[PDB]
Design a protein around this nucleic acid. Structure first.
Ligand SMILES: Cc1cc2c(cc1C)N(C[C@H](O)[C@H](O)[C@H](O)COP(=O)(O)OP(=O)(O)OC[C@H]1O[C@@H](n3cnc4c(N)ncnc43)[C@H](O)[C@@H]1O)c1[nH]c(=O)[nH]c(=O)c1N2
Length: 460
DNA sequence: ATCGGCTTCGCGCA
DNA sequence: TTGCGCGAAGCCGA
């Protein structure tokens, strides 16, 4: 009934006479969720209800109010969404490995389902969970069109080798979603406290302007499943046609803007591809866009899955390692610390501008992110430091941060992963180089700089 | 084979 | 700002 290559058995065994509970984690949405549909499926063939369980963890302390509210404001809207289909959602606070354990016990779950994520800490949690349960345990890729473990059984060296695999698998996986049928059988803190608690927890780290005013502008992106869908519709109707020709222009904003929604799972990219595919646009712009949400977004999962040190210098390709190592003792033009990068006090004002876009909006322009990471590698004392600075700023300040897409982007920029070797230079070696004067022939750099000049002088 | 083609490069010049 | 060919560069896969 559903394509069963989207399921992997974690733990086998006997079905409890209790509810089917979805350990929701990555795909925080009620529609177009292959994982919650699997849950409803084996629930219905069991005459049991489905419930959903979410577990909140101290990981929010590692980022910002901006993300925590994006996720929490979302989950309030999910709660109404599930409840109106008779699906209870329960919200746990703590370590999954040992609270999902207690839950499975306290409620005698018939079976357990979770979505798929390649992040290391999730594979730790699944382990702590299996060790402590005896009921079955399933994982479902609800996040990729083509399940990650089916797309490829190895690390793909680049897109041109991955892309033929994905598209061969595409006609059998690109399909429509079925309706989420409500519970036939009507079947731990409240959500409002966790929001306010967390906020009081994070306020003293809040980026403030020099006049105590918060730096973040929460209005560029309304959180939520509802909201996500208006973003994609308006993008397919207004911006898709221009995506190819205007995407590399930080002065326009012809991006789809879906990445904070995708990251928190508030929208499936399968619904997106689906709607794009029937859309009558420029074939140029579709291909470019399909390629970003399909090849690049998914090889970003393949990356982390097959490379446990996805955030490490060790996961760069051999040639990139030799090159950067050969240039470790090169004199650097400038050397900034994390904090000088952080507050945009470099000599480059294009760079500082993108540091200001990231600080205030929560979302740096896809093209600028690539310049940003490279001038970090140029102006830091070592690669490993460069890498560690760009991760830290990516996850602290991007709304889409803490994401497979993030590590594999940084790897690309600093370490050449999924890229190729270019003319050898000082410091950066054979890693692909970008310049301010290459930026000038592509967009009106002065316009970008002008937009974010009013922040730097009043940052501290 | 073994060779072309490779996300998002820079640069000069029309 | 446009595009177009060339440049330096390591390596996958048909
Ligand atoms: C230095 C640096 C740092 C990061 C990233 C790249 C670079 C160069 N990326 C990837 C990319 O920059 C990001 O996905 C886009 O900016 C998404 O913004 P839009 O949704 O507007 O993209 P746009 O509308 O152009 O593309 C649509 C979608 O395609 C996918 N996509 C586009 N560019 C991609 C890329 N380079 N890699 C993978 N998937 C891509 C994403 O799902 C994106 O939502 C990333 N992404 C992310 O979600 N979180 C992050 O924290 C980072 N970090």
């Amino acid at each position: 009934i559903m394509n069963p290559k989207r399921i992997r058995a974690l733990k086998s065994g006997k079905q409890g006479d209790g509810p089917v509970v979805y350990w929701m984690s990555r795909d925080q949405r009620a529609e177009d969720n292959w994982a919650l549909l699997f849950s409803r499926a084996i629930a219905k063939e069991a005459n049991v209800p489905v419930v959903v369980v979410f577990c909140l963890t101290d990981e929010f302390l590692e980022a910002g109010i901006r993300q925590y509210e994006f996720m929490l404001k979302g989950l309030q809207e999910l709660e109404v969404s599930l409840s109106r289909k008779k699906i209870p959602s329960f919200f746990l606070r703590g370590d999954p490995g040992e609270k999902i354990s207690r839950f499975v016990k306290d409620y005698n779950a018939g079976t357990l389902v979770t979505d798929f994520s390649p992040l290391r800490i999730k594979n730790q949690w699944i382990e702590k969970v299996i060790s402590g349960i005896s009921i079955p345990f399933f994982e479902v890729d609800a996040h990729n069109v083509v399940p990650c473990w089916e797309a490829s059984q190895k690390h793909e060296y680049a897109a041109h080798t991955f892309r033929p695999k994905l598209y061969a698998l595409l006609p059998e996986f690109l399909e429509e979603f079925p309706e989420l049928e409500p519970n036939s059988v009507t079947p731990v803190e409240t959500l409002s406290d966790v929001l306010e608690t967390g906020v009081k927890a994070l306020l003293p780290e809040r980026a403030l302007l020099k006049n105590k005013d918060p730096l973040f502008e929460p209005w560029h992106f309304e959180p939520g499943e509802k909201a996500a869908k208006k973003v994609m519709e308006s993008f397919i109707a207004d911006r898709l046609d221009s995506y190819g020709a205007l995407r590399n222009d930080p002065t326009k904003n012809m991006l789809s803007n879906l990445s904070p929604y995708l990251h928190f799972g508030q929208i499936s990219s399968q619904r997106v591809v689906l709607e794009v595919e029937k859309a009558e646009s420029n074939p140029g712009s579709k291909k470019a866009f399909l390629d970003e949400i399909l090849i690049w977004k998914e090889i970003s999962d393949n990356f982390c899955y097959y490379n446990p040190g996805y955030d490490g210098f060790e996961s760069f390709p051999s040639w990139a390692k030799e090159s950067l190592n050969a240039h470790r003792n090169d004199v650097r033009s400038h050397i900034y610390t994390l904090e000088e990068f952080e507050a945009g006090k470099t000599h480059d004002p294009l760079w500082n501008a993108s540091q200001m876009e990231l600080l205030s909006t929560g979302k740096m322009h896809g093209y600028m992110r690539m310049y940003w990471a490279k001038k970090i590698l140029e102006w830091s004392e070592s690669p490993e430091k460069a890498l560690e600075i760009a991760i830290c700023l990516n996850d602290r300040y991007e709304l889409d941060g803490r994401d497979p897409n993030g590590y594999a982007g940084i790897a690309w920029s600093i370490g050449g992963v999924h890229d190729r070797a270019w003319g050898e230079r000082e410091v950066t070696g054979k890693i692909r180089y970008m310049s301010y004067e290459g930026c000038k022939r592509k967009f009106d750099v002065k316009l970008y700089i002008e937009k974010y000049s009013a922040l730097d002088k009043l940052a501290a």
